[PDB]
Scaffold this motif. Sequence first.
Motif, PDB file in Angstrom:
ATOM      1  N   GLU B 171      80.466 -45.524 -33.727  1.00 14.65           N
ATOM      2  CA  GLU B 171      80.110 -46.886 -34.128  1.00 14.65           C
ATOM      3  C   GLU B 171      78.836 -47.360 -33.417  1.00 14.65           C
ATOM      4  OE1 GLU B 171      81.074 -48.488 -36.583  1.00 14.65           O
ATOM      5  OE2 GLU B 171      80.473 -50.574 -36.281  1.00 14.65           O
ATOM      6  N   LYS B 172      78.835 -47.242 -32.096  1.00 17.41           N
ATOM      7  CA  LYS B 172      77.640 -47.458 -31.303  1.00 17.41           C
ATOM      8  C   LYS B 172      76.459 -46.612 -31.832  1.00 17.41           C
ATOM      9  CE  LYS B 172      80.625 -48.649 -27.461  1.00 17.41           C
ATOM     10  NZ  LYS B 172      81.417 -48.134 -26.313  1.00 17.41           N
ATOM     11  N   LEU B 173      76.626 -45.285 -31.836  1.00 22.78           N
ATOM     12  CA  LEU B 173      75.619 -44.333 -32.345  1.00 22.78           C
ATOM     13  C   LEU B 173      74.969 -44.735 -33.664  1.00 22.78           C
ATOM     14  CD1 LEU B 173      74.119 -41.678 -31.945  1.00 22.78           C
ATOM     15  CD2 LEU B 173      75.872 -40.535 -33.275  1.00 22.78           C
ATOM     16  N   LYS B 178      70.456 -47.644 -36.428  1.00 20.37           N
ATOM     17  CA  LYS B 178      70.101 -48.714 -37.355  1.00 20.37           C
ATOM     18  C   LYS B 178      68.982 -49.590 -36.796  1.00 20.37           C
ATOM     19  CE  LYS B 178      72.169 -52.320 -40.251  1.00 20.37           C
ATOM     20  NZ  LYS B 178      70.872 -53.013 -40.018  1.00 20.37           N
ATOM     21  N   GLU B 179      69.054 -49.896 -35.504  1.00 18.02           N
ATOM     22  CA  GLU B 179      67.990 -50.647 -34.843  1.00 18.02           C
ATOM     23  C   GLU B 179      66.674 -49.858 -34.704  1.00 18.02           C
ATOM     24  OE1 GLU B 179      69.625 -52.249 -31.262  1.00 18.02           O
ATOM     25  OE2 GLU B 179      69.159 -50.485 -30.047  1.00 18.02           O
ATOM     26  N   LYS B 180      66.749 -48.612 -34.256  1.00 16.50           N
ATOM     27  CA  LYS B 180      65.531 -47.836 -34.075  1.00 16.50           C
ATOM     28  C   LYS B 180      64.795 -47.715 -35.408  1.00 16.50           C
ATOM     29  CE  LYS B 180      66.281 -44.987 -29.974  1.00 16.50           C
ATOM     30  NZ  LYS B 180      65.408 -45.892 -29.176  1.00 16.50           N
TER      31      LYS B 180
ATOM     32  N   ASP C  27      70.462 -35.852 -29.315  1.00 20.72           N
ATOM     33  CA  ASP C  27      70.741 -35.833 -27.887  1.00 20.72           C
ATOM     34  C   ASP C  27      70.234 -37.088 -27.186  1.00 20.72           C
ATOM     35  OD1 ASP C  27      72.166 -33.443 -27.858  1.00 20.72           O
ATOM     36  OD2 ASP C  27      70.341 -32.238 -27.657  1.00 20.72           O
ATOM     37  N   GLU C  28      68.995 -37.488 -27.467  1.00 22.03           N
ATOM     38  CA  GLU C  28      68.448 -38.726 -26.905  1.00 22.03           C
ATOM     39  C   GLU C  28      69.321 -39.934 -27.244  1.00 22.03           C
ATOM     40  OE1 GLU C  28      64.476 -39.201 -28.295  1.00 22.03           O
ATOM     41  OE2 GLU C  28      63.812 -37.206 -27.665  1.00 22.03           O
ATOM     42  N   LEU C  29      69.814 -39.984 -28.481  1.00 27.96           N
ATOM     43  CA  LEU C  29      70.634 -41.109 -28.943  1.00 27.96           C
ATOM     44  C   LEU C  29      72.011 -41.108 -28.281  1.00 27.96           C
ATOM     45  CD1 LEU C  29      69.639 -40.959 -32.696  1.00 27.96           C
ATOM     46  CD2 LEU C  29      68.748 -42.458 -30.942  1.00 27.96           C
ATOM     47  N   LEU C  30      72.625 -39.930 -28.210  1.00 27.09           N
ATOM     48  CA  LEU C  30      73.914 -39.779 -27.551  1.00 27.09           C
ATOM     49  C   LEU C  30      73.842 -40.261 -26.105  1.00 27.09           C
ATOM     50  CD1 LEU C  30      75.685 -36.552 -28.822  1.00 27.09           C
ATOM     51  CD2 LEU C  30      76.286 -38.976 -29.105  1.00 27.09           C
TER      52      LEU C  30
END
Lengths: 351, 352, 36, 36
Positions: B171-173, B178-180, C27-30
């Motif tokens: 959910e966070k991910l 979505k923001e980026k 990986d950066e996002l995680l």
Amino acid sequence: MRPERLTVRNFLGLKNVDIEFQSGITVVEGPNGAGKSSLFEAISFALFGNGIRYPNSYDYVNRNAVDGTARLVFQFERGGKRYEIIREINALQRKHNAKLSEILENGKKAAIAAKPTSVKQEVEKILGIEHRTFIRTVFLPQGEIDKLLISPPSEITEIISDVFQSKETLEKLEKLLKEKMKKLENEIKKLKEMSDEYNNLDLLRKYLFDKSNFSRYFTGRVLEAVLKRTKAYLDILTNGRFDIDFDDEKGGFIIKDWGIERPARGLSGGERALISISLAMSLAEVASGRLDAFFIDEGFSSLDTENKEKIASVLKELERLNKVIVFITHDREFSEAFDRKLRITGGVVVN
Amino acid sequence: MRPERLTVRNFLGLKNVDIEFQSGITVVEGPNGAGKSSLFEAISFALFGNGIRYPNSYDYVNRNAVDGTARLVFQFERGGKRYEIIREINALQRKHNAKLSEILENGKKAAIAAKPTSVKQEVEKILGIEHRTFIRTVFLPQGEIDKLLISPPSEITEIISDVFQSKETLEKLEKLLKEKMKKLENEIEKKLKEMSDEYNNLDLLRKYLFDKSNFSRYFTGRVLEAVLKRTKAYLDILTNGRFDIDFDDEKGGFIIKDWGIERPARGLSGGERALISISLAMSLAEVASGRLDAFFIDEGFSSLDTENKEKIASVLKELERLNKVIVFITHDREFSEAFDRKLRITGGVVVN
Amino acid sequence: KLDYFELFKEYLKKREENHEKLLKILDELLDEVKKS
Amino acid sequence: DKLDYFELFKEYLKKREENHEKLLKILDELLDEVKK
DNA sequence: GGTCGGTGACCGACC
DNA sequence: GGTCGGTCACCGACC
Ligand SMILES: Nc1ncnc2c1ncn2[C@@H]1O[C@H](COP(=O)(O)OP(=O)(O)NP(=O)(O)O)[C@@H](O)[C@H]1O
Ligand SMILES: Nc1ncnc2c1ncn2[C@@H]1O[C@H](COP(=O)(O)OP(=O)(O)NP(=O)(O)O)[C@@H](O)[C@H]1O
Ligand SMILES: [Mg+2]
Ligand SMILES: [Mg+2]
């Protein structure tokens, strides 16, 4: 409804079976997948053309049968009269045939219905109950023993009413009495005398179809008779610990545990089985003449050794009744308690 | 989820109970109304705040109790970390107090959640699963042993997959992505290709993770194969190659084969359904070790004849090996004495 | 290991050619997720 | 039998009605053109 | 099509 | 750690 003979070919687990039924108690013994439940659904499918376990009719046909045909012949008695239902469910041809004939004193067979849809309507008339009522009261399937007990008050009352009333009469009476009010409204001293008739039929309609009056009273008066026997069965079985009463407001069947109140769902496995079984054998007693069979498919395994034997003891004291009582079990500890046995293994009766 | 300790006062049919859970198999054994399942709903309640048998919390308070208050302390390990949950349900005052604390290695209790809802929310984040997944897979209630097997297709996949993925993480991910993406399009020579090229890489990655059609589907399928592989194995051992199992969602769910003849789960006998259900359960239990390290099966060997009860018990014993908290609940002495470690409950207290 | 994210790395490598670049972004996002 | 619907209903009225003569009359006429 | 409006989620502060 | 309030961002709407 009093089962007399049942012939099964290639229905579910069954290969061939041929059973006379009689008054008294019979235990149907057998391993898992032996065909015990199949024989139960068989009766269900003979009468209502519905089973328990499958949504679709052609599923009930034994898939190993080489002609893809299941045949059922059921003979039963009601109210002096005597009826025969024959069924073929052909799974290859996808054809389902079914007739219901009366068997008269001179040995001929007067036909009352052919095909599934009108046989069911005829069955539902002769019996005076629908399938749901049948399986919730005196014909309790595997794993569904406590459904009545824990049901909401609305459902319980519908079930009870139906056992003790003709829905065929009530459906017409309510309709006829509608017709005689819209025929008085239709009209437009005579207009005062037809205003005051519309109003006397309307008082009658109210006391009879308001939910909400005599239905609420009648259910009360039946459950009063039913719970009187259950309370006594429960006094014997639990040494005065459990009491049962019925309250619409409190959500349904309401149990007292040394006086303490508890909703039927609060109970445990065994206590539920125990308090469904004494409530079921109570209903069957109060419904003799209307309902004349009492079937149970495997309650008694929830129960510990003390309770199983106690339950067996009271049940055995039904042996006297003019009732076709049949219990189904794999448990030999329970079964040995009874005299008349019917053993089923591999889809056939043995020995 | 590895139950370490559990203490109870006045919950359902229990008076007092203090229980340290061990590895391998314990059998809880005792008569109708002893309090066996009561302990079982106590664990489920302490973690998720919900019983099995009552929609309303205040009904779990033992009505015999003179204070009208139930107390629950559950302590458990997940992923190295240790937690403790304390809950007080007061039926008299209509009060439900709950709180969750990490028990740090030193031993101080660091608070995490201090309300019934904040506790339930943190618990789901920790354990990885919602309450329904818990009671269909590895914590199986009395009379509900076969609920996963006869379950409709869409539920079966929501449940088994929930075990192996994180609603919290995903959910966070998805949001951060979505923001980026929004910022990049907000930020609108070579730099543009860089700013616009990473915009697309993000979007191509978005497509692969979150279009349900894509990886989500594939994942569920890989998961299922793993579970059914094991289930088929168990079935060969238990039924002499008679019964196979597979999954088809256009066929209404789990489908069994009987010497090659197709048959939907709901068509099996009471015994055959319990024997195959347990197989499926044991399999999920093996495949989710480290994520769920407990395995509780209450009332699941009743409609099982003598040959199958003996066969089922022997197989279940072959889990004693594993580092897990495994618990079977029975009222049947016959079945319970096939094992070694017994926990005996009568009158809502532990005995012997 | 049946890990959601381990399986994705294998699933993406099969049908995606720009995967090495893409797994990297993941990986950066995680990481930014775990931090929060 | 005791738990006969209308025999139950013959009585539920006598408690709740004074005009229960013409009413149970009406009920009887109606059940008859249902019998027919 | 761009600007105005309202409502919905996150965050920090204060109990 | 809980609660309650403020603000900003986003989709909707009408401009
Ligand atoms: N709120 C309650 N307060 C007090 N007693 C209760 C309450 N709810 C249920 N009980 C009783 O507590 C006893 C224990 O219940 P339960 O834990 O379900 O029994 P169990 O050991 O699992 N027995 P069984 O499932 O029959 O083999 C039973 O006698 C219940 O009727
Ligand atoms: N359509 C079908 N064709 C053939 N066999 C079937 C069909 N449906 C079910 N069966 C099997 O028929 C057998 C008899 O089932 P059933 O009559 O319910 O057994 P049972 O006697 O009640 N055993 P149990 O409940 O374990 O005590 C089982 O092996 C079923 O899997
Ligand atoms: Mg059966
Ligand atoms: Mg129990």
